[PDB]
Amino acid sequence: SMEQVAMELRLTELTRLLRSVLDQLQDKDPARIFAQPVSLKEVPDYLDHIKHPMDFATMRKRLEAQGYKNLHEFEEDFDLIIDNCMKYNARDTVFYRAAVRLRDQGGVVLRQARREVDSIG
Numbered sequence: 001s002m003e004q005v006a007m008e009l010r011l012t013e014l015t016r017l018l019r020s021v022l023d024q025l026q027d028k029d030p031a032r033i034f035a036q037p038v039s040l041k042e043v044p045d046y047l048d049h050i051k052h053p054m055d056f057a058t059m060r061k062r063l064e065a066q067g068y069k070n071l072h073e074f075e076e077d078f079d080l081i082i083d084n085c086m087k088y089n090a091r092d093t094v095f096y097r098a099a100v101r102l103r104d105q106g107g108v109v110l111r112q113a114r115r116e117v118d119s120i121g
């Protein structure tokens with residue numbers, strides 16, 4: 001139908017805007033601490049600690065499949081990255097500190113993305 005096409009074009013455009021959002025957030029992680037899944041070879045007990053692992057590569061896969069239906073879903077996954085890190089790692093670690101910086105710097109990006117998504121529909 002024409003409506004299914006129109007809905008598909010809206011999802012494509014959302015995907016384009018979330019891709020730019022993801023690029024901007026990942027720039028706030030220049031050490032690449034959150035770029036890939038935590039390695040189960042190297043942290044073999046990780047899944048005993050963290051039930052829903054997340055990282056930027058995994059988000060990018062979902063994004064390119066048009067798997068985010070709205071900005072809320074995308075923010076949920078970003079928040080897992082931060083929140084998982086802040087639980088597994090102690091406050092005095094490079095990892096925890098990197099997550100706090102990512103959260104603080106990403107807040108700005110996500111604030112305007114919410115306005116852009118509401119504005120463009």
Ligand code: NA
Nearest residue numbers: 086087088089
């Ligand atoms: Na902790």
